[PDB]
Design a protein around this ligand. Structure first.
Ligand SMILES: *[C@@H]1O[C@H](CO)[C@@H](O)[C@H](O)[C@H]1NC(C)=O
Ligand SMILES: *[C@@H]1O[C@H](CO)[C@@H](O)[C@H](O)[C@H]1NC(C)=O
Lengths: 651, 638, 49, 48
């Protein structure tokens, strides 16, 4: 009956400490256990290439969170890098209490993890997005560790040519976590996109890359932007909406542009074949720098019939509009093109990725949807209708209809109720009217006869910020109240962070303080033992993207306008001593560039931090082992264990 | 046996619509309904008489709306409400009172000079914040209290806006003048706003001296750091030299510190000076550092321009020396908790001078996992799960800012009592809501949770919920419950009718185990963002491509509700900043409205009758279940 | 969609300050709404006195 | 002076710093970025 749990992340990143959580379940008050935990290679020999970490547990302290280092030297020593097929290492928890008390066959219990080689973060920056051939390129690369603090490790940068050939390689010994370097593009370089990579010398797969386009150009004077009236066209047989565009020309310094806009229309398929209408062209002057144009239904249908086609064929095609305005009397001409005006049959969209799957019976099932306009910002105030059919539990199926208007950012949380002994649930979601966006989802109930279910309820369905406490309501449904505590844990960025023990009451509430080491998302895994079987549930929370751990405000007090040669006072403020990496860039470079090349902002940093995570899906499982596997854990008590990951990426 | 119930607001108001909720439980067929209101002492006359029929289609849910005329036939005036439920009759006597409205006075500036013109507007509103045409008297009083100007205005046809102007003579009493406004009908309620007359003063440039913190901590080795800021009257910064000298202040005697005199360069327009702790300790020749507690410091700075010889002086007196700067309080916690279910607190941390704190961690003592961070308004919201017994719950909160020691942290202790079961039946109702701020257009999910023995669970088929807002009864309904379910979620829409914090009261009734009747109820107080029902935005119509230049024409764009009347005024922004004591803001208006709520206890009561009375409701049934009569027009002090 | 836009022109005064326009609207259907202050910063570089 | 970029320096900040910039003779709208790298607060980009 007594059991010793063991939790650890599914994937080990060599050279970075491993968060191993041990727990003691159903132990008499008079028993105190002590042992050690270490990594181990199963093939070479039982040679522990990790410093053994001791743990002591008792009735009053039945769990302990240990940090287990995995140094590079020991890991290389045991032949982990000499394995032929399969990068797999084992973690073992050895204690003499197992043999003495449980009389087990052996006193070794553990899991089969899957090591990797990624470590730390590297960020690369270049002087400007687009370069002229034969122009110097200045790039700097910052290096940080997994804790997001500056690192002094050694990287090996390398430039690549447009064809893919290496052009320059270097190795650096950073004492300041920044490396700056210059190189010259060959004068005869053909147009293309060059890539700069940077990886840790020890870690083979710890690379990070940036791209810059090489193209022969002269910096423009003004930018031309084409904006559709709506980002979509309704090709529904009932009706076809109006096609109207606004073309705006603006000098780089703000003043409008006087000139003549020449616009041409055509069809464009996803393959990349353009079919222009020999006609329908527009030639209009610009008033206040903006010109309003439109294509009437009659002329559009005439053009379509002249092309030997009907309006039914406009399924994947998009209307392609090209413009080439000529400034007057300067004479300079600039061109713009639009490749995002799709033909659609529904002006809305539905994203049911937030909705859980295979959820517990006897508790409300929350359907979460994000209604978004076709190629646009999330909608608000658009009614959403859900028809949920609870399939045969033994009798005829029963249907329910619930309608709710989206509040803000498109979020809608519709609590469809589900009875006990449910078989399956079928969900038909329709957003907006007329011309609704329809989505479907089917959920299969867990097999009957289980030891119970755990329901995790979130009273607030909005993304918490940083520094705000979060409350979840744990409850046990369809089970016997024989236990006394709920055990829960948090999983952020692929490593166990928190592990606690909450007493059991009616509607137990747990509070988690959203700190700065939980962003941009975390998994809340809770469970309890109903006799000799685990009952578990999980949940994913997306912390809202906001400010940094520190701060940096570059502010220039005064008006935006200036004059060449003026002196500008630039203020920098932080919370500690920091190496501010400054850079001032022209804006006409973006106009010169054919394709958008977004810079390094907080979105990229947040994606970098959470790319190390092992979680997969919005949470929930048919059993305890499935829940832990979805979360990203490695559980093994003696009778149950999770099979090793087959590949780093979830199916 | 069928049970008939009647629910109505605790206090009824004259010439205002009042909703009466009528119910029949375990009653078959349909039942005719006639509700009448009479005088309490003798039932001499009928003030109103309405009728309706409760149909089984709507689960015998009915709401009858009546208006109590301002007959003033009799004299705390009471009226008895008698409802005939078919043959059955239920009677309940309810208190009656009338409210007049609100006056808001807007002044462009708070500091004038002899000769300038005082411009002020009077806004007339009712309890729903709607314009109303009444007659209001406006007076202006000098510091001695002698009314110098008296006016009698009528806001009828003016859309609730009354403009007024006063011309200050060249020789007037100097001090704090006041403006008094009150409706003619009810002169007992006077609304006052005050300003100052002062004397003509105009320095060469403005200088502001303030420390980074709002106090001084004795054991803080960093010392006291002060930031001197200077800028001209036209916006540009000042570059010069500032001479700063600190000084202790033992009540009223200033033991100025000679060694702390410093000279600092003001560059970019901002400086910085630090007083070392050693200097302050050696200044008073006292070996004990704790002896300086309560001896506030002061800073005197003298800024000298670098170009000419212009000199201005600034001061900042009253920087306290404290070892326990933060004091901790409870604000909106209930006092009765359902045992075995979560209990929501709320905490307010304030500075020594009485201002709300900011980013001060709080935490309950012994749990350590219920931490939070104090918000902009000083409110930190926590939750603690309660024990399953019925002994009182003692909860202690402590601030956990790192700089201080454990013995110097704030601490407040509160005791809560269990909700009293009717017959020790251990039957409870629990309403769980999000503990944040909502906005109109969002949807709120209220989780009705029920616990009782697994022998009478099937005898409850519904929950009844009532929403109270602005004292009035907002809406009611039903929550059909499928048997076997413990938790039932109500998706509740939020509209602009919920703009000030509303209250939700739910209950269910069933036959008792012994054979009597049972009513179990709970309530929650939910706060939503304070904003106008409509919208009003002022922006620049012209293209934003130039800084405004003196004397040139500028185009403004006002966007608002159609047919509204918009009034404007422009201020220097030098007097707006110092007006932080009181400004005309939507939050202040909604707070003024929130100060006249019928019920005052946050979210629970000792019994079901306590729950119904605290929320501002009355509940009478054909059986022997009723809430105690309320006679006072204001509930006891907090 | 419920919003009424009115374009009003004003003649800025000859003081080198930063004005703060305060707007309050009265409507018989929705009531009283207080708009946020609007900052107009008047600036100049060369002054002859 | 018509450069396509300038101010490619890495200046440390001791909780505050003021830098003076001489705008080049180009007539455009410069966008000024900036990062941070602190031993106790990690990386943090700033709004251009
Ligand atoms: C790192 O290199 C691999 C190939 O070794 C490549 O597939 C992967 O995309 C790179 N990771 C980046 C660029 O983040
Ligand atoms: C009163 O009944 C009317 C019937 O039209 C309904 O519209 C309104 O919402 C009801 N109010 C309450 C408080 O039940």
């Amino acid at each position: 009956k007594p059991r010793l749990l063991l939790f650890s992340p599914s994937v080990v990143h060599l050279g970075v400490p491993l968060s191993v959580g041990v727990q003691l379940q159903d132990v008499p008050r008079g028993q105190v256990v002590k042992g050690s935990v270490f990594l181990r290679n199963p093939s070479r020999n039982n040679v522990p290439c990790s410093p053994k970490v001791d743990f002591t547990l008792s009735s009053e302290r039945d769990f302990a969170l240990l940090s287990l280092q995995v140094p590079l030297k020991d890991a290389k020593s045991c032949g982990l890098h000499q394995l032929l097929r399969g990068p797999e290492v084992q973690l073992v928890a050895h204690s003499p209490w197992l043999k003495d008390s449980l009389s087990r066959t052996t006193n070794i219990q553990g899991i089969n993890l899957l090591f990797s080689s990624r470590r730390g973060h590297l960020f690369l920056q270049t002087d400007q997005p687009i370069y002229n051939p034969g122009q110097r390129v200045r790039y700097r690369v910052f290096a940080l560790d997994q804790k997001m603090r500056p690192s002094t490790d050694t990287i090996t940068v390398m430039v690549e040519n447009s064809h893919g050939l290496r052009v320059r390689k270097k190795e650096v010994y950073m004492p300041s976590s920044i490396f700056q370097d210059d190189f010259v593009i060959p004068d005869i370089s053909e147009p293309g996109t060059w890539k700069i990579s940077a990886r840790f010398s020890d870690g083979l797969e710890s690379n990070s890359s940036t791209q810059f386009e090489v193209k022969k150009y002269v910096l423009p004077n003004f930018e031309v932007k084409i904006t559709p009236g709506k980002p979509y066209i309704l090709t529904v047989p009932g009706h076809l909406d109006e096609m109207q565009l606004d073309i705006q020309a603006r000098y780089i310094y703000g003043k409008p542009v006087q000139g003549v806009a020449y616009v041409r229309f055509g069809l464009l398929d996803e393959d990349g074949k353009k079919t222009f209408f020999r006609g329908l062209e527009s030639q209009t002057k610009l008033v206040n720098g903006q010109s309003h144009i439109s294509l009437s239904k009659a002329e559009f249908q005439d053009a379509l019939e002249k092309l030997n086609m009907g309006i039914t064929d406009l399924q994947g095609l998009r209307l392609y509009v090209a413009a080439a305005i000529i400034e007057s009397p300067g004479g300079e001409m600039e061109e713009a093109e639009l490749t995002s005006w799709y033909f659609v049959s529904s002006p809305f969209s539905l994203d049911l990725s937030k909705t859980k799957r295979h959820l517990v019976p006897g508790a409300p099932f929350l359907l979460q949807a994000l209604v978004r306009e076709m190629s646009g910002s999330p909608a608000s105030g658009i009614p959403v209708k859900v028809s949920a059919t609870v399939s045969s539990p033994g009798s005829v199926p029963e249907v329910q209809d619930i309608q709710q208007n989206t509040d803000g950012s498109g979020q809608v949380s519709i609590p469809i109720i589900i009875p006990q002994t449910i078989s399956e649930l079928q969900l038909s979601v329709s957003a907006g009217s007329p011309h609704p966006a329809i989505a479907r989802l089917t959920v299969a109930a867990p097999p009957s006869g289980g030891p119970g279910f755990l329901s995790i309820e979130r009273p607030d369905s909005r993304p918490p910020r940083v520094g705000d406490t979060l409350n979840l309501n744990l409850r046990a449904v369809g089970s016997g109240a024989t236990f006394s505590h709920y055990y829960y844990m948090i999983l952020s960025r692929g490593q166990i962070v928190f592990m606690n023990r909450e007493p059991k009451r009616t509607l137990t509430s747990v509070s988690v303080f959203v700190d700065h080491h939980l962003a941009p998302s975390f998994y809340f895994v809770a469970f309890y033992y109903h006799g000799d079987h685990p009952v578990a549930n999980s949940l994913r929370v997306d912390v809202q993207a906001g400010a940094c751990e520190g701060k940096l405000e570059l502010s220039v007090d005064g008006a935006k306008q200036y004059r060449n040669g003026e002196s500008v006072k630039l203020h920098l403020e932080t919370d500690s001593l920091a190496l501010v990496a400054l850079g001032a860039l022209d804006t006409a470079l973006y106009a010169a560039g054919s394709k958008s090349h977004k810079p390094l902002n907080m979105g990229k940093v947040f994606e970098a931090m959470n790319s190390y995570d092992l979680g997969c899906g919005p949470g929930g499982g048919d059993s305890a082992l499935q829940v832990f596997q979805a979360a990203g854990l490695a559980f093994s008590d003696g009778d149950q264990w999770t099979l090793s990951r087959k590949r780093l990426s979830c199916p | 046996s069928p049970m008939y119930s009647i629910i109505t607001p605790n206090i009824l108001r004259l010439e205002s619509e009042e909703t009466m909720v009528l119910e029949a439980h375990d009653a078959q067929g349909d039942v005719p309904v006639t509700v009448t209101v009479h005088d309490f002492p003798g039932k001499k006359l009928v003030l109103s008489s309405e009728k309706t029929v409760l149909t089984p289609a709507t689960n015998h849910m009915g709401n009858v709306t009546f208006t109590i005329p301002a007959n003033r036939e009799f004299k705390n005036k009471f009226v008895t409400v008698q409802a005939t439920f078919g043959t059955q009759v239920v009677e309940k006597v309810v208190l009656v009172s009338l409210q007049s409205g609100y006056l808001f006075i807007q002044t462009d500036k708070t500091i004038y000079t002899p000769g300038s013109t005082v411009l002020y507007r009077i806004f007339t509103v009712n309890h729903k914040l709607l314009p109303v045409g009444r007659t209001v008297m406006v007076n202006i009083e000098n510091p001695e209290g002698i009314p110098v100007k008296q006016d009698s205005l009528s806001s009828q046809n003016q859309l609730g806006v009354l403009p007024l102007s006063w011309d200050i003579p060249e020789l007037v009493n100097m001090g704090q003048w006041k403006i008094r406004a009150y409706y003619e009908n009810s002169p007992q309620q006077v609304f006052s706003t005050e300003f100052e007359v002062k004397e003509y003063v105009l320095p060469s440039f403005e200088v502001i001296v303030e420390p980074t913190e709002k106090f001084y901590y004795i054991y803080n080795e960093k010392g006291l750091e002060v930031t001197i800021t200077a800028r001209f009257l036209y916006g540009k910064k000042v570059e010069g030299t500032a001479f700063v000298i600190f000084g202790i202040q033992d009540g009223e005697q200033r033991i100025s510190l000679p060694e702390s005199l410093k000279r600092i360069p003001i560059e970019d327009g901002s400086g910085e000076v630090v007083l070392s702790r050693k200097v302050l300790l050696d200044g008073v020749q006292n070996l004990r550092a704790e002896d300086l507690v309560g001896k506030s410091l002061y800073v005197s700075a003298t800024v000298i321009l670098h170009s000419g010889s212009d000199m201005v002086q600034a001061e900042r007196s009253g920087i306290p020396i404290v070892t326990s700067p933060y004091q901790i309080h409870f604000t909106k916690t209930p006092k009765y908790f359902k045992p075995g279910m979560p209990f929501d607190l709320m905490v307010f941390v304030t500075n020594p001078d009485g201002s709300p704190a900011y980013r001060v961690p709080v935490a309950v003592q012994g749990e350590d996992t219920v931490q939070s961070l104090t918000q902009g308004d000083g409110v930190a919201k926590l939750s603690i799960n309660t024990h399953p017994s019925q002994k009182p719950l003692s909860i202690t909160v402590r601030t956990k800012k790192q700089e201080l020691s454990e013995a110097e942290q704030a601490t407040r202790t509160m005791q809560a009592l269990p909700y009293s079961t009717v017959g020790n039946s251990n039957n409870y109702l629990h309403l769980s809501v999000l503990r944040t701020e909502l906005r109109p257009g969002e949807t709120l999910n209220v989780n009705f949770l029920l616990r009782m023995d697994r022998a009478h669970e099937a005898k409850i088929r519904y929950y009844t919920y009532l929403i109270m807002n602005k004292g009035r009864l907002l809406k009611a309904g039903r929550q059909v419950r499928e048997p076997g379910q413990d938790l039932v979620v109500l998706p509740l829409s939020i509209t602009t009718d919920f703009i000030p914090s509303f209250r939700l009261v739910a209950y269910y009734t069933l036959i008792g185990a012994s054979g009597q009747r049972e009513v179990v109820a709970d309530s929650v107080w939910v706060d939503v963002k304070d904003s106008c029902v409509g919208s009003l935005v002022v922006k620049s119509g012209q293209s934003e491509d130039r800084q405004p230049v003196p004397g040139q024409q500028m185009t403004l764009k006002i966007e608002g509700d159609h047919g509204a009347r918009v009034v404007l005024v422009a201020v220097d922004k030098g007097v707006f900043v110092l007006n932080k004591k009181n400004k005309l803001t939507q939050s202040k208006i909604w707070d003024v409205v929130e100060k006249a709520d019928i019920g005052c206890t946050p979210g629970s009561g000792k019994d079901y009758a306590g729950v119904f009375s605290d929320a501002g409701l009355t509940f009478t049934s054909s059986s022997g279940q009723q809430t105690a009569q309320r006679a006072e027009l204001q509930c006891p002090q907090p | 969609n419920g919003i009424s836009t009115k374009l009003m022109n004003i003649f800025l005064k000859d003081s080198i300050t930063t004005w703060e326009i305060l707007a309050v609207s009265m409507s018989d259907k929705k009531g009283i709404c207080v708009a946020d202050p609007f900052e107009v910063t008047v600036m100049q570089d060369f002054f002859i006195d | 002076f018509f450069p396509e970029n300038w101010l490619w320096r890495v200046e440390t900040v001791d909780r505050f710093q003021i830098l003076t910039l001489w705008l080049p003779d180009s007539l455009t709208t410069w966008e000024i970025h900036g990062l941070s790298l602190s031993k106790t607060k990690g990386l943090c980009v700033a709004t251009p």
